[PDB]
Amino acid sequence: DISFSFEGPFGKFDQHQLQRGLQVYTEVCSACHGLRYVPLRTLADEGGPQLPEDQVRAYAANFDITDPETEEDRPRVPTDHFPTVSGEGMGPDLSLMAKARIGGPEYIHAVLTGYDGEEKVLYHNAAFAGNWIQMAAPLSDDQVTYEDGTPATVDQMATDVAAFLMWTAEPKMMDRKQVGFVSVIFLIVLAALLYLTNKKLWQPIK
Amino acid sequence: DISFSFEGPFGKFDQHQLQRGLQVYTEVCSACHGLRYVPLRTLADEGGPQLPEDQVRAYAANFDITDPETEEDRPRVPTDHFPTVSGEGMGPDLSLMAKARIGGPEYIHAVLTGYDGEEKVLYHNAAFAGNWIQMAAPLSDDQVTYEDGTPATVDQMATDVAAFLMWTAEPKMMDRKQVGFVSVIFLIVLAALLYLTNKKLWQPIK
Amino acid sequence: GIPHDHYEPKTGFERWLHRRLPIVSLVYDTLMIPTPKNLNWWWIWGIVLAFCLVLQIATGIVLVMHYTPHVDLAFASVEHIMRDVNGGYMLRYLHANGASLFFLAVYIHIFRGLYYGSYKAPREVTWIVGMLIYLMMMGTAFMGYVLPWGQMSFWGATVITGLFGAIPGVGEAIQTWLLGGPAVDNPTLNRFFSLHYLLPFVIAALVVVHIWAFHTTGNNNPTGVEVRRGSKEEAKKDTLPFWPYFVIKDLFALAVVLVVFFAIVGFMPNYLGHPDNYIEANPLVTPAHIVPEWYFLPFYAILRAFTADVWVVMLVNWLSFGIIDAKFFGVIAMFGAILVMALVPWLDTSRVRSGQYRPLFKWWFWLLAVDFVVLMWVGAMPAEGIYPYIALAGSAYWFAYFLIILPLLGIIEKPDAMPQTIEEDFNA
Amino acid sequence: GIPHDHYEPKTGFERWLHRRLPIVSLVYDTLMIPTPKNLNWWWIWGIVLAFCLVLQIATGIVLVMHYTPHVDLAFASVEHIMRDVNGGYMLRYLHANGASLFFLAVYIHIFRGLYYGSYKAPREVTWIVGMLIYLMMMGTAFMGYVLPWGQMSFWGATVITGLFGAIPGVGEAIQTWLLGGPAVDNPTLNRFFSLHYLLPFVIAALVVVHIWAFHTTGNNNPTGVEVRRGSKEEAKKDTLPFWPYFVIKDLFALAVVLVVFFAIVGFMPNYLGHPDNYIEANPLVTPAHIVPEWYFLPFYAILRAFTADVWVVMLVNWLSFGIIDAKFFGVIAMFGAILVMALVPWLDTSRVRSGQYRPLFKWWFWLLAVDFVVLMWVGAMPAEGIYPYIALAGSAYWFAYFLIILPLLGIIEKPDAMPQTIEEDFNA
Amino acid sequence: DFLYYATAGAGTVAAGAAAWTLVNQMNPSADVQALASIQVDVSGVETGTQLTVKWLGKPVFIRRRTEDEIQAGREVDLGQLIDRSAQNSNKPDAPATDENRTMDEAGEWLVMIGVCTHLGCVPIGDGAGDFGGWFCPCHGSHYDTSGRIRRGPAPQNLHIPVAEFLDDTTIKLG
Amino acid sequence: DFLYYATAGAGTVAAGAAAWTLVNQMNPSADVQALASIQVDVSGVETGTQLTVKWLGKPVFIRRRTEDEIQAGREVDLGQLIDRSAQNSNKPDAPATDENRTMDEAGEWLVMIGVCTHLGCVPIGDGAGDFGGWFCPCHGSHYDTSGRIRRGPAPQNLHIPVAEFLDDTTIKLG
Ligand code: HEC
Ligand code: HEC
Ligand code: HEM
Ligand code: HEM
Ligand code: HEM
Ligand code: HEM
Ligand SMILES: C/C=C(C)/C=C/C=C/[C@H](OC)[C@@H](C)[C@@H](OC)[C@@H](C)CCc1oc2c(O)c(OC)cc(OC)c2c(=O)c1C
Ligand SMILES: C/C=C(C)/C=C/C=C/[C@H](OC)[C@@H](C)[C@@H](OC)[C@@H](C)CCc1oc2c(O)c(OC)cc(OC)c2c(=O)c1C
């Protein structure tokens, strides 16, 4: 039960953390895990890492894609999805993990952080299958340098990419919390006026 | 305005002509033309060329396909469709031509049979979209040896592949005619009983 | 209303049921409604329409079980319906030709009504609900047609979504909205598919209200002379119960229609369509011979007749300061062609009902009838005069008829002599 | 029928319109039906259901515009709806929780009925139409749940199509027919999509027949004492017009319900579903924790409760010479669970209507109610005893209640003293 | 009034033929009807391991049983069973003893349609369940070490498909 | 009865917000608003030839004109023309002369969005139509050699896109 900027009804992603997490993703997770349902351009949007266009464009450019219409590769562009990853020794796509496992980002963090050392080619894990995951503990310290100081400790890294993963799952979380706020407040007002109206319609009869 | 066993209400395909036409296809047209909507297994159905199983399978074998779930090539099996052809210098898919052009098979025939010699890389043709086609005359005589001894004259071959192509467009022509026959006759009988009933009902009133 | 006689529960079940849901009373009233005894064969087209609605929907629901509304798979999915699905080819040709049968039937139905004054008081409402259904049928049919995603489907979708972008001011928006983006593409396929499924249900509803309204006024009849309301004995003299008399006469007519229909489904399945829809949509090429679906041709003839060359076009173009050009004029003329027909109860000011008894009328009506076929036929001919001229004449005759001829006649025409009553008419 | 004052046209238009389609008379007799004035907050779940019906359809038509029913594109299409469509996520979450509000409301609705005798003469038909709607809702909901083609969709689809394959003799064929082949696959996805679209329209029709029935008998009320029909002055004492009085009580209550609904939709959009449907159908693995949709949990519970171990199952397996094994029994027991609820008007032989005045009833009824929640609960717990025992007790109570307890009280029980008129009740 | 029967009868027929087309388009279509053989190469699967291959929309289990499982299997008396049948398509009326369950006259190879005979879930293996066989999470069915149904609603032992060895290191399905 | 208004009012609002939600989902969704530039290779296009390339779900026409078409297009007087606007994005404000229409001073490179300004069919070229430019088969519009609209329903000259030459052989669209 660690916590994040975003649980609760007034929660919001933390942009920086989200970028830290994107970076952990890029530099570590993406070798074994894809994100098919995430279009690269969304990295740009209000409510997420919100990198700026030219960075998102630069970032997109490090990924390869076999052009359907053609048949040559080209570097990726913002309209493409992150790559789909798979084959042998390759993990479940992660675009929805935070929602698929409600305790989502905690489970990702629990798992990344839950290797003891054992090896029955399985590996003991506090949080998985109970308790042998086939994913060799993927993170060790300062395995990433954040342009932003933050000590790249394993716990940190697991946390950032958990937040980041939460956002690939619910990109519209902020929108959805905001609209929800206005709907509820609006219905509460409405409920109230129908309440009075209704009361006034009824006092003469009671 | 040639003629075919299939035109008219009582017309059926000629199984042998269809075989001759498929041979013409396989040996001349498939270089430049696919039949994506024709699944190889239907080469064995009633109402068509109707090869035996083993031969359909043996036939499917001469074709390659990139296995979707694999990535390895492999000879084709009857459940695959014929290949899809396209690129520089390739022709429109042929599966539906005989209905897309009603005098469909006539058009195919009139076109294979309407090259006058001239060139421009176009080629004067009697029957095309007036009158320059980008298709070098595909047929010349004895360009094919029919196992059944029909003179492989250009005219013949144009006619056979034309029938064949009528079948790839309407593989169900014969079920349709036959269901047609049974419904019209049934309705005519129904119409009659309803008429007599209506009459018996309205006599006392009139 | 017409003196009729109400339902009478007898059974154990019926007494029980009637106290709690008087559904058997409702059926009975619908099926026993006193119908003028002198209806002629022009009256059978309502049942053919009902049949067609029920046919389109039944085949429709079931086609959707094997169809995929995606641009990479739509056209392949129709092919797999033709070839692999039990009775597939037949369901497909049923649903497509059914649309044609549907449209023949309305045009006929509509003209029966235009001739016999079935839109005149007190039947305005039956008529407006008619017109609405009509509009819905066209929308519905346009969208189904898009579904195969062939060449006609795709350039159809373009042209028709284009009608809206002609509106001044907001047309670019309504157009972006309908398209789902900057061009006829997958979003367009995807939303039309939804509406194609939905609209036929709205049509069934409107049809319920349709039948309700003519049950309210009572049917019209060839003479234009109402059933007598003065007592039971004489209302009986003018009418018969819809069941069994007209039910079985319609069922018969229907069968005869269905003999032809199945003949076509069976032996000339593609004769009413455009071969080109057997080629896969291509966003770069519109085929040289792109002819609208036949039941759309008159309206299409009206539209393109109105080019820059046309003088009413330059007149209006000038007066409106450029805001109404040929493109917009053409669109206003085509929807206008439909609307004035909607308005005919208020345009036709002759107090006489049935055309049967109006001698000047018959001529003008029949010219309308020819107009309509001739527009249809010109819709299929290319621009290059003399066709434009024919199309121009036809349009003008279309509006002249509703706007000019019909009102004048109210003033000038002399009714022939009508029968006193339907029982009278019937006896000859 | 209840003396009520009927619609009278004044306006010129209303006079015109009344003669040709008396659609305003219809609206009036609906919004003005005389309602018992003593209704309590239980009477509001009907309007909440109507709301849900209109909400599932509205959001549904609109989701279909961006959804693709193909096994290779279904899941991606839901993801594209969530991410790219204007308001996508919100509509998606509305339609999903929407289903849950729907079932929340029917169960409550239903239980009100079972408590207050709203199925007893003369309201049997209302109830039976209620039960059709109920069956239909369940079928509808299952199919929709396949649509995203997640792991739950797929194994859910396998399992429920499995129920039909249990029928001896004809089950493999019904199974092959529903599947469209030897396994849940694209044909399955593709037909459930059609039916998901169709069924909600059939449900709307039944709901029209539903409202019609209660208008015919009149609403029930907490006392079970019918509105007086002796004169208008009496009936007025016992009732009030549905409009403005209950339309507004209703709209207010709905508003309070929607306050929670949107809270959930805004902040806990996924707490009422299974995470696991965020993973893509995999035909090689069924997931270890596979729990049905909550609204299905009691009937599901009734299902597994019946293993080979169970004595009634061995007795019946034996008597039946093997034709009824635990597999068939469990299915029968499950649809049986639903059916015996359907038949309650002919099982509850007590002549007193309302549970209020039944003192042995109040007990068995709450037990029933608890039973239902407890069953929901176990369905979500592992087989592994002591839950099977809790599940078996539960079921046996469920059948016991309709099959034994209710007929018993026919004879055993003694009504406490009722108020004599509704107006009586109200004054207290 | 013979007119009446032919006419009503004809209607009937028209109605039935209509209803049937509507019903019959849902039966397997022609492409879906090719149920071809296949060959899984089992050269890979070590011991106490199960490979799972897609065949016909459904999983197939191929397990190489450990010593004990073959033992465990062989104990168990016909009479202790729910399904005395060996549900085996190439020993087609055999009893449900272990020997009629495996391909090899020797006990080691366990080939099964990995479909729960209850309502078609896929039972979890690696000896999950009260008989370290398979447990099927859908309604709690436990299968024993030779795939026989021991506890729950499932009425039959996991079936065995037409199947043999081609090379020593290969298996042919159907 | 200020109560009345706040209640009717909010009723209305919830209705508006409900309708806008249903209406707005149909506006182009996020993955569709990426209208990216692109770049054509025009080194292959011989004189008197048109290249057609999809851009933005639509055809772009790139024709390399013959010297007759250039002349033909240069003869016409602003006055004989239906649309006097050059409909040019790279000259948003100019006359419909020939020189305002092409990309180059020589009049050789006529680049246009290839969509009849009438109702969107792709007009046919290779000199088709009464003015040896393009003919649009959908309602009979004829465009001349500079793609200017001469006869029919279409109100405008085929548009000229944002475009220019990078290298000799490469045109940059958008
Ligand atoms: C290859 C060395 C990997 C790298 C680097 C990462 N992961 Fe992985 N992951 C891998 C495998 C083979 C699996 C399947 C585990 C199994 O045997 O089931 C996984 C799985 C996960 C999971 C969850 C699996 C589940 O719950 O079913 C998560 C949440 C996950 N992986 C996360 C993750 C992160 C955040 C990584 C970047 C630090 C990462 N993994 C790297 C293989 C590999
Ligand atoms: C390459 C050597 C070809 C072979 C061999 C065949 N065809 Fe072909 N075909 C080819 C091209 C490049 C085209 C396009 C022609 C055009 O400019 O539009 C075609 C076209 C056709 C058509 C009609 C197309 C139309 O638009 O009406 C038909 C009916 C056709 N081709 C048939 C056909 C047959 C039956 C062949 C076997 C003898 C055959 N073609 C061979 C290229 C080539
Ligand atoms: C008023 C009733 C209807 C009309 C007028 C109508 C019209 C049409 C037309 C003209 C086509 C194209 C025919 C073709 O060339 O293939 C079509 C296709 C289609 N229709 Fe309908 N339709 C109606 C009802 C329905 C309904 C209720 C459904 C719901 C399932 C439906 C589903 C389909 C489908 C899936 C297609 C594409 C398959 C095909 O092209 O045959 N239709 N419709
Ligand atoms: C879905 C399409 C339609 C259906 C199913 C339908 C059905 C019917 C039926 C069964 C009748 C009564 C018998 C008859 O006169 O044929 C009828 C009558 C009538 N309909 Fe239609 N109809 C449809 C479309 C239309 C349209 C498009 C119009 C006008 C634009 C129209 C106008 C009328 C009129 C004026 C009558 C006569 C009412 C009377 O006799 O008083 N209907 N319709
Ligand atoms: C789509 C689901 C349904 C809708 C929209 C609906 C609608 C309504 C409405 C508006 C009422 C009247 C006011 C009220 O008491 O709440 C009502 C009453 C009633 N409903 Fe439903 N209902 C539905 C489902 C059901 C079901 C599933 C049942 C039983 C299985 C049922 C049984 C009844 C009964 C017995 C009444 C009482 C009639 C009376 O008081 O005379 N309803 N329904
Ligand atoms: C009684 C009314 C309805 C019920 C009870 C119902 C139930 C459901 C359920 C449980 C789902 C899956 C929810 C999820 O995604 O987790 C669903 C999905 C879906 N429904 Fe419905 N539905 C109803 C009405 C409709 C209607 C009329 C349509 C017509 C378009 C429709 C279209 C869809 C579509 C396209 C999906 C897949 C997208 C999605 O999963 O959200 N629904 N439905
Ligand atoms: C989302 C739902 C929508 C947007 C519904 C829109 C409905 C619009 C109208 O009905 C109400 C419309 C269908 C109706 O106009 C009255 C028809 C008579 C229009 C006839 C029509 O057809 C064509 C067609 O079929 C074509 O095929 C290749 C091609 C066409 O040009 C080349 C046309 C065309 O130029 C016209 C005018
Ligand atoms: C083509 C249309 C068809 C075939 C319609 C069929 C309708 C059937 C019934 O409605 C009438 C049915 C839906 C209804 O039973 C009465 C429900 C209460 C059944 C509840 C139900 O759900 C499950 C479920 O959701 C699951 O999710 C992953 C998994 C399940 O096992 C693992 C089940 C399950 O074991 C049961 C009993």
Ligand code: FES
């Ligand atoms: S399906 Fe395996 S136990 Fe129900």
Ligand code: FES
């Ligand atoms: S769209 Fe080109 S002329 Fe109408």
